């Protein structure tokens, strides 16, 4: 999805 979050995932591992 182009419109999905394109920033760092705040919940990344």
């Amino acid at each position, epitope marked *: 999805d*182009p*419109n*999905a*979050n*394109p*920033n*760092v*995932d*705040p*919940n990344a591992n």
Partner: antibody
Framework: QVQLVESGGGVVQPGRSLRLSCAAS????????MHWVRQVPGKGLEWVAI????????YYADSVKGRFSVSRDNSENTLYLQMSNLRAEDTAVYYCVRAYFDSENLYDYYGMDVWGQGTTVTVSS | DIQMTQSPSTLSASVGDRVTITCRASQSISRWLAWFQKKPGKAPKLLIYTASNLESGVPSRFSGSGSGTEFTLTISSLQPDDFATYYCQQYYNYWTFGQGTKVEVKR
């Protein structure tokens, strides 16, 4: 203050290539998606490309697909737009635009928030 | 692809007027609509996001309404700083802009 400063615009002959740059400051550049948007004289604002924060995903408008490429260098806080096979319909002000930033990721669909002032590209012989 | 249409193209108004401008989407975009303000030769500024949510520092006199295909921006009492062109933008399916509404000084 979030600041985005485009550079690289100028005159370029039809069919040739030109690379634009955007110098980002006042936020963590490597955490933000980024966009290019243009405004051709006498036309509306036209989205050009997006690139993910980590460079892993990127999408283009049909009108530049196959000719333009977006990339970034997070270690230098710089966004790039490599243009090729330029034609008169590409004459425009090109803007660097930050994807909407949301540290809490509240919404599922993303727009854009802060714009640079633009760099002008003139495609002419 | 989704097309955005604004009306009117130009709105003549005076300081203190209530001003409403309209944006239509060719297909439903739910609440994924933004409003930007642009002055001549200057970068657009984001005013409203998620159709109705005012951005930080945006004055209380601005309001956005709508969900689906019909959207409005209202300025409850126009101020001198508000003469500008306003653009809507949908961010549901890629990103597309309306042609803009110029709010100009009435005389």
């Amino acid at each position: 203050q979030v600041q985005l400063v485009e550079s690289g615009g100028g005159v370029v002959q039809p069919g040739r290539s030109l690379r634009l740059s955007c110098a980002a400051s006042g936020f963590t550049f490597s955490n933000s998606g980024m966009h290019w948007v243009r405004q051709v004289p006498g036309k509306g604002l036209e989205w050009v490309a997006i690139i993910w924060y980590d460079g892993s995903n990127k999408y283009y408008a049909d009108s530049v697909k196959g000719r333009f490429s977006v990339s970034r260098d997070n270690s230098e806080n710089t966004l790039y737009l490599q243009m090729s096979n330029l034609r008169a319909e590409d004459t425009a002000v090109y803007y660097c635009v930050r994807a909407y930033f949301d540290s809490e990721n509240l919404y599922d669909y993303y727009g854009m928030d802060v714009w640079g002032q633009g760099t002008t590209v003139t495609v002419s012989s | 692809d989704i097309q955005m249409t604004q009306s009117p193209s130009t709105l003549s108004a005076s300081v203190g007027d209530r001003v409403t401008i309209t944006c239509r989407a060719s297909q439903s975009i739910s609440r994924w609509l933004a409003w930007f303000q642009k002055k001549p030769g200057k970068a657009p500024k984001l005013l409203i996001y998620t159709a109705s949510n005012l951005e930080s520092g945006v004055p209380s006199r601005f309001s956005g309404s709508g969900s689906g295909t019909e959207f409005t921006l209202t300025i409850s009492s126009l101020q001198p700083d508000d003469f500008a062109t306003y653009y809507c933008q949908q961010y549901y399916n890629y990103w597309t802009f309306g042609q803009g509404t110029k709010v100009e000084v009435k005389r």
